[PDB]
Design a protein around this nucleic acid. Structure first.
Ligand code: TTP
Ligand code: DOC
Ligand code: MG
Ligand code: MG
Length: 323
DNA sequence: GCCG
DNA sequence: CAGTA
DNA sequence: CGGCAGTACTG
């Protein structure tokens, strides 16, 4: 749809990402998307360069696959890449940890299990290695959001619970369940992680915690593992955010994504002198190297339609925000 | 990697 | 803070 | 030349 050159460029982009080339991998990912998001198959080098996201270097790699049906660079990928990919797919381990485990001589999850030094999160990630690479049907994500909502609404009926991420973008499968919690009164959303997590543990729903700062009263997120009851259940990842009602549209926009749509909209805000985050859309933001020097003023954004409007953009329903 |  | 998210 | 989103835990 309408190119197989992306299949070859994805192998080389995955290789740079696992090796830590964060920015070289990004350039490849944007070129891959531009190639998947195009009408007529690319037949010329000038036709390849005309597309935004494809430069001279990327066009000549596309001209090599068109002429030869083979990209020479793939025959000289580091032999470590499959192992680094295997290790970075552990929750809590990234490019740095995987490179370190590789230098130390580990080549399998058996060597990680028996010989590696694992963090608490890395040990939970390894314990659910397959389940965590598995996507659930959106119907199970409904069961999970309904579980979190029932426990949250049980102690405070006014609480608003919404499933975001891929679920809200109408996707058929979900990597995890992203639940946003808020309160229309603007003050009762405070200190509910204590009660909500307590409640979900009493019923044996939460199996493990990955990120959960419960010592602080200003805990913003919960990242953990859950499992619905009955046979045939797998362990599913859960992501909960509790936000002030005033920041609802921005938190809802942020948490619906995609990650690439948020980046694209935030980069656009930067060009209009504004700043967009999960908390607020700000204006008159002073910047130096593109870093915040001044705070600016928060703009009133009661709904997601106001964020698009204040940025001079037409509204995009969640399903049209995949990129 | 790409682009201002 | 660097790593990971 | 140099930024590539902006922010939240963990130890
Ligand atoms: C990972 C990531 C997520 N987010 C936002 C947008 C995502 O839609 C939202 C939820 O995070 P994710 O759950 O990682 O993404 P997802 O729901 O789109 O897809 P998946 O089915 O793979 O779970 O958080 C960012 O803004 N930046 C990031 O780098
Ligand atoms: P993890 O499962 O990859 O991430 C869980 C949540 C999703 C939103 C948040 N996140 C992840 C990565 C980045 N770069 N920024 C974020 O806000 O962590
Ligand atoms: Mg990982
Ligand atoms: Mg998700």
């Amino acid at each position: 749809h309408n190119l197989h050159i992306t299949e070859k460029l994805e192998v080389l982009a995955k290789a740079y990402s696992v090796q830590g080339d964060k920015w070289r991998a990004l350039g490849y990912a944007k070129a891959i998307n531009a190639l998947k998001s195009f009408h007529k198959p690319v037949t010329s080098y000038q036709e390849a360069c005309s597309i935004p996201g494809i430069g001279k270097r990327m066009a000549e790699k596309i001209i090599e696959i068109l002429e030869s049906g083979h990209l020479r660079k793939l025959d000289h990928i580091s032999e470590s890449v499959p192992v680094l990919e295997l290790f970075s797919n552990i929750w809590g381990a990234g490019t740095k940890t995987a490179q370190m485990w590789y230098q130390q001589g580990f080549r399998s999850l058996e060597d990680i299990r028996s010989q590696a030094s694992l963090t608490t999160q890395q040990a939970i990630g390894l314990k659910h290695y397959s389940d965590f690479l598995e996507r659930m049907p959106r119907e199970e994500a409904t069961e999970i959001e309904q579980t979190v909502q029932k426990a949250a609404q049980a102690f405070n009926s006014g609480l608003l619970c919404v499933a975001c991420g891929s679920y809200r973008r109408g996707k058929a499968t979900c990597g995890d369940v992203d639940v946003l919690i808020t309160h229309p009164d603007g003050r009762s959303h405070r200190g509910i992680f204590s009660r909500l997590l307590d409640s979900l543990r009493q019923e044996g729903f939460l199996t493990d915690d990955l990120v959960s700062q419960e010592e602080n009263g200003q805990q913003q997120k919960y990242l953990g593992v859950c499992r619905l009851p009955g046979p045939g259940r797998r362990h599913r990842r859960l992501d909960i955010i509790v936000v002030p009602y005033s920041e609802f549209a921005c938190a809802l926009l942020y948490f619906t994504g995609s990650a690439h749509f948020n980046r694209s909209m935030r980069a656009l805000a930067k060009t209009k002198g504004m700043s967009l985050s999960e908390h607020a859309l700000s204006t008159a933001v002073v910047r130096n190297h593109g870093c915040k020097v001044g705070p600016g003023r928060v703009l009133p954004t009661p709904t997601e339609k106001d964020v698009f409007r204040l940025l001079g953009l037409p509204y995009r329903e969640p399903a049209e925000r995949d990129w």
